[PDB]
Amino acid sequence: YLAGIEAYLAVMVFALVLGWMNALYFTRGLKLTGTYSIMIQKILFKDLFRFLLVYLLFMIGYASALVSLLNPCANVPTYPSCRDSETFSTFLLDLFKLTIGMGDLEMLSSTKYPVVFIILLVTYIILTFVLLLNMLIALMGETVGQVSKESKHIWKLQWATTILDIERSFPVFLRKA
Amino acid sequence: KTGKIGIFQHIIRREVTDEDTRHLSRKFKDWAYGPVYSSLYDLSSLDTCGEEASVLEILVYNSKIENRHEMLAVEPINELLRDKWRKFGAVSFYINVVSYLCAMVIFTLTAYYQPLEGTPPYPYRTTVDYLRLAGEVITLFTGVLFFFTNIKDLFMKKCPGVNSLFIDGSFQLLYFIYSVLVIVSAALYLAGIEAYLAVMVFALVLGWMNALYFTRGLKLTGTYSIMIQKILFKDLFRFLLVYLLFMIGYASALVSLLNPCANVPTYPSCRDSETFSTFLLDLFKLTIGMGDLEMLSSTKYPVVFIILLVTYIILTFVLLLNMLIALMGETVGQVSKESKHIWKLQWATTILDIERSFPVFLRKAFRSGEMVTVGKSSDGTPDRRWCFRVDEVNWSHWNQNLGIINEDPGKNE
Amino acid sequence: TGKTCLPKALLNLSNGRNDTIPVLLDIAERTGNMREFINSPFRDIYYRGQTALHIAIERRCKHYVELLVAQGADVHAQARGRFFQPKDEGGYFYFGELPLSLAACTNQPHIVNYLTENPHKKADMRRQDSRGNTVLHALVAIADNTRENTKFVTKMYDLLLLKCARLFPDSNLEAVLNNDGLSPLMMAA
Ligand SMILES: CCCCCC/C=C/CCCCCCCC(=O)O[C@H](COC(=O)CCCCCCCCCCC/C=C\CCCCCCCC)COP(=O)(O)OCC[N+](C)(C)C
Ligand SMILES: CCCCCC/C=C\CCCCCCCC(=O)O[C@H](COC(=O)CCCCCCCCCCC/C=C/CCCCCCCC)COP(=O)(O)OCC[N+](C)(C)C
Ligand SMILES: CCCCCC/C=C\CCCCCCCC(=O)O[C@H](COC(=O)CCCCCCCCCCC/C=C/CCCCCCCC)COP(=O)(O)OCC[N+](C)(C)C
Ligand SMILES: CCCCCC/C=C\CCCCCCCC(=O)O[C@H](COC(=O)CCCCCCCCCCC/C=C\CCCCCCCC)COP(=O)(O)OCC[N+](C)(C)C
Ligand SMILES: CCCCCC/C=C\CCCCCCCC(=O)O[C@H](COC(=O)CCCCCCCCCCC/C=C\CCCCCCCC)COP(=O)(O)OCC[N+](C)(C)C
Ligand SMILES: CCCCCC/C=C\CCCCCCCC(=O)O[C@H](COC(=O)CCCCCCCCCCC/C=C\CCCCCCCC)COP(=O)(O)OCC[N+](C)(C)C
Ligand SMILES: CCCCCC/C=C\CCCCCCCC(=O)O[C@H](COC(=O)CCCCCCCCCCC/C=C\CCCCCCCC)COP(=O)(O)OCC[N+](C)(C)C
Ligand SMILES: CCCCCC/C=C\CCCCCCCC(=O)O[C@H](COC(=O)CCCCCCCCCCC/C=C\CCCCCCCC)COP(=O)(O)OCC[N+](C)(C)C
Ligand code: NA
Ligand code: NA
Ligand code: NA
């Protein structure tokens, strides 16, 4: 913003979202919310990274498989029927929308083999929304029942580390008061 | 081979004290300074690099799966496999993974740059099309490679209760499929038929789903890829059964209410000749949530139509697909302990396969052990056994003065 | 190493009795050496400082600890070897470095009394090893949070700082810091 480059914003926009997500730091003053912000961080480890791994295998697999069926636009200007140069990119997003539910199949006749296309989408929808994203819910239940006792113990350290940091920041005559 | 733990344990930790029969021992006490001692196991039959038949290849390949995890979770076996993983089992496995992922990148790029005009697009005539040909030749190698390796397995290790066997029983089956489709697609791409693609497209998706094979190098992801396979059995096939009964029932019931197009050209109001087909998909979308009711007045009885959709939506999204979530929770709490035990077999089977693929001089270079003069064999002949140390601590068993081979405690390096 | 007759006897101990140690020290006297023979430490980089007395207690033989001390051998020799080093450097068993700290860290009370209350040269509890760690610093080191370990750690812990008060009536031994700046309580934490 002082060197003249105009991408001060984009970097600034990531900072903004961290900082509000760094307000979860201050959930230590209550066992409720402090136990909450550490399960979020445990269900983000022994949980939704394992999911991101396989989900990127199922997704690259199908996204490469289904765009392989769409015919190029050299064949001609219209993308949403055809394939050219950003097909993969937009098509991953349409597959990311499908697993979570806020998409529409938008079934396509432009492909060369149309029936095999829908055999693959329905397997994506079964093996990602009905099988994985619901198993993703079930693994959390196996987590939050196990890391609950740990989570009450980690908060007691968080909470204690908070106090001794405040105390340590005082002068000695004020600590001694 | 028969799954007898209680005696299998007792043999491997056989401490005999009377020196006339100490040679009938397999746990020794190399040294003991105070409350810390080093126990020294006999790997005479367990870890034989090549030449002899081994206890460890028997537990891991041809044994009873109901007790392998308890037979591999005893004295040195578990320590012995970790001692193989850090040497070569880790590394070579993580070369197997990158080589496979690349091969699937290489198989990805061809299909994306595979043309779609005319006869099967033989003519290359450019550099990029020769780069693609490098991807198809490297590909077909992978197919025939996974073909031969699985057929020699059919003459050798193979055929447990396949695909209900979470120790590479299923993946052997799937790499074999992937091996076929790359041979079929290459046959039709060379026979002139233009459906090389459709077969090739199923191969691509298997192979990325066959990269779940390589989730064994971590307890996290390996425990993950076997729950997927258990929640696909004691879970979402039961669902597919009833869900196909509720669905055929309603799909036949609701299309029975729509009036034919002989009555006239417009489907989305009317019924003709693909009504059922498209209408199943609209009902598949409803249960999962990414559909719209798209309520229809074209039917002859419109009110009874919505009485049935709302029962589909209650008995499939609110009742079954949410019960489907709840049964998983009953699964993943029960098959977690099994899943940590199956990984230990997967992980072990991975090591012994890599080890078995080495020549004997290289296995004999990555030996897990050491020659030790453990005693005299009553002829003056010193017993030079290849053994394995285990430091151990006990603040209660103070009289450790039985079999102290090395009077000088420490390993004195 | 530097091993001698007198260690070799105690390593090769027959049911708590090797009849040679009363003999060799008689012959050691008639040529003449007791404060050079018994004391002779292993000059290795791995058993450094270890003596016959460090061996007489780890074998759990009380009868000769009286004998080795009867001639006034040593009760503050420091076993600084890489073996006598914690399990954070490349060692196995850190008891401190002293024979008193050894007997306390091996659940052997009677010598811990003896090396304090004997006729001859006494082992005081204030003596620091090469890291400042006294006997109580050491009991915090060998301790684990099991059941049988915490039993005799607390007993031999108690036994000494009570015994430090009936002996030198001054600063408690638990106040004695070390060469990191810590006390036995701050060392346990
Ligand atoms: C010594 C302890 C080391 C401890 C520290 C950690 C060291 C790690 C090194 C890891 C080496 C292994 C990785 C190399 C690539 C590899 O092994 O790739 C393998 C196969 O590769 C080969 O066949 C190539 C033959 C040469 C390989 C060894 C080269 C390294 C040698 C140097 C290491 C040091 C020791 C000896 C050198 C010789 C001199 C005598 C030493 C003593 C002193 C002189 C991939 O598996 P794949 O078959 O695809 O999977 C099986 C398939 N299935 C059965 C599951 C279906
Ligand atoms: C270790 C921390 C350090 C980070 C290193 C990166 C730092 C700096 C990179 C910025 C320089 C690059 C841009 C310069 C060129 C440029 O100008 O490029 C622009 C476009 O560039 C961009 O958009 C740059 C996007 C930057 C974001 C990077 C990631 C930031 C950090 C990410 C991590 C934090 C995540 C948080 C998210 C929350 C979720 C997770 C929370 C955690 C889990 C809960 C071109 O367009 P134009 O308009 O023409 O530009 C003007 C040019 N002109 C015409 C004036 C010459
Ligand atoms: C045991 C393995 C062996 C499999 C056996 C099947 C092998 C080969 C069949 C291929 C020949 C048939 C086509 C020839 C006729 C033809 O050409 O037919 C086409 C259309 O035909 C097709 O599209 C055929 C679809 C093939 C897919 C079959 C299933 C493949 C295997 C399925 C299993 C694996 C699943 C994986 C999915 C992942 C999820 C689950 C993972 C597991 C759970 C996690 C007609 O159109 P046209 O353009 O005119 O064609 C050109 C004709 N012309 C004009 C040149 C004369
Ligand atoms: C250890 C593995 C390392 C391997 C990394 C290799 C990755 C990339 C290098 C190769 C890409 C080079 C760029 C391609 C050429 C290009 O520029 O293509 C552009 C298009 O954009 C692309 O194609 C790039 C998107 C991706 C493409 C598929 C590859 C997918 C890569 C996925 C990597 C997966 C990693 C990991 C798996 C996931 C799990 C986690 C891992 C395990 C645990 C940590 C130009 O298109 P256009 O000209 O319009 O073509 C039209 C052609 N028409 C119409 C004439 C026929
Ligand atoms: C294990 C998962 C993977 C299984 C894959 C193996 C099964 C099938 C793949 C092969 C299908 C090949 C279809 C034919 C080739 C093709 O595409 O031909 C097209 C047209 O096709 C058709 O007319 C085929 C009629 C519809 C029936 C489809 C198959 C059966 C459907 C039911 C599948 C059920 C199982 C599975 C689905 C549920 C999965 C969830 C489970 C859990 C997953 C883990 C070529 O156009 P053209 O003839 O030129 O156009 C028409 C003629 N006109 C008028 C233009 C001249
Ligand atoms: C310190 C160690 C020193 C050694 C260094 C490495 C030395 C040599 C490397 C040799 C590479 C090739 C080895 C192949 C091993 C093999 O045959 O692997 C197979 C996997 O299938 C293949 O490979 C396909 C065959 C075609 C080759 C791959 C594609 C073409 C070559 C690509 C190489 C480029 C790499 C990487 C470039 C990108 C780099 C990103 C780094 C990033 C680091 C983080 C093992 O399957 P299997 O075990 O049998 O399990 C299968 C399942 N079943 C049957 C047991 C049930
Ligand atoms: C052990 C049981 C074995 C029984 C299998 C019998 C199956 C099929 C044989 C009969 C079908 C013959 C073809 C029909 C005629 C035809 O060609 O009809 C076509 C249309 O397409 C169809 O009708 C075929 C789609 C399905 C139709 C309903 C049957 C549903 C079958 C479901 C099977 C369920 C299995 C299992 C239950 C699920 C649970 C798992 C099991 C238990 C555990 C493993 C022509 O229509 P169009 O000319 O347009 O007519 C218009 C008429 N208009 C407008 C003039 C009035
Ligand atoms: C156990 C589950 C199954 C229960 C089924 C039994 C209950 C009802 C079925 C019978 C309904 C018959 C309706 C009348 C016939 C018909 O359809 O007449 C049509 C029109 O209709 C009407 O005007 C009926 C008014 C609306 C009230 C509907 C019923 C009551 C609704 C509430 C239902 C609540 C219970 C259940 C629903 C919730 C279920 C979730 C629980 C859990 C499941 C497991 C004929 O057109 P026309 O008169 O010519 O057109 C109007 C006249 N004009 C202007 C054109 C001349
Ligand atoms: Na739940
Ligand atoms: Na939804
Ligand atoms: Na929705």
Numbering used by the authors:
A (entry chain A): 567 to 641, 654 to 755
B (entry chain D): 379 to 641, 654 to 803
C (entry chain A): 190 to 378
What does the paper say about this structure?
Transient receptor potential (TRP) channel TRPV4 is a polymodal cellular sensor that responds to moderate heat, cell swelling, shear stress, and small-molecule ligands. Transient receptor potential (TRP) channel TRPV4 is a non-selective cation channel that is ubiquitously expressed in most tissues, including bone, skin, vasculature, heart, brain, lungs, liver, kidneys, and bladder. The cytoskeletal remodeling GTPase RhoA has been shown to suppress TRPV4 activity.
The corresponding 3D reconstruction resulted in a 3.0-Å resolution structure. Upon inspection, the cryo-EM map of hTRPV4apo revealed numerous non-protein densities around the TMD that represented annular lipids. A closer look at the ion channel pore in hTRPV4apo revealed two constriction points, in the upper pore or the selectivity filter and at the lower pore or the gate region, typical for the tetrameric ion channels. The selectivity filter constriction is formed by the backbone carbonyl oxygens of glycines G679, with the cross-pore distance of 6.6 Å between the diagonal pairs, permissive for conductance of hydrated sodium or potassium ions. The narrowest point of the gate region is formed by isoleucines I715. With the 10.2 Å distance between the Cα atoms of the diagonally positioned I715, the side chains of these isoleucines face the center of the pore, likely forming a tight hydrophobic seal and making the pore impermeable to water or ions. Confirming the closed conformation of the ion channel pore in hTRPV4apo, measurements of the pore radius show that at the level of I715 it is smaller than the radius of the water molecule. Interestingly, in this non-conducting apo state of hTRPV4, the pore-forming S6 helices contain a π-bulge, signifying the region undergoing an α-to-π transition in S6 during gating in other TRP channels.
